[PDB]
Fold this sequence. Notes:
This is part of a larger assembly, with 2 copies of chain A. Chain A is mainly α. The first copy, chain A, is about 95% helix and about 0% strand. The first copy, chain A, has helices at about 1-40, 40-49. Chains A, B: It comes from Rattus norvegicus (Rat).
Amino acid sequence: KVREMELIYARAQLELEVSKAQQLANVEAKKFKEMTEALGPGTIRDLAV
Amino acid sequence: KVREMELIYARAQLELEVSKAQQLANVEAKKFKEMTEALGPGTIRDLAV
């Protein structure tokens, strides 16, 4: 029974964990996408060339 | 019987483990894919050339 409850904590906490990492990955990637959409191709072009 | 219960903990925890690593691999690869879709081929082109 302790193994069972342990499976409950495991599945729940793992799901919340993956959801957190996913949502943070979302805000991060959306942030970087906002950056490249903002400063534009030519700015990173300036940094590169 | 202890070996049997041990097989239960083993299969369950291993399944949850592989599921976790898989979902995290999903958020990671989706993150990187979001990056390359965002900054674009020409940005990594700028970093490379």
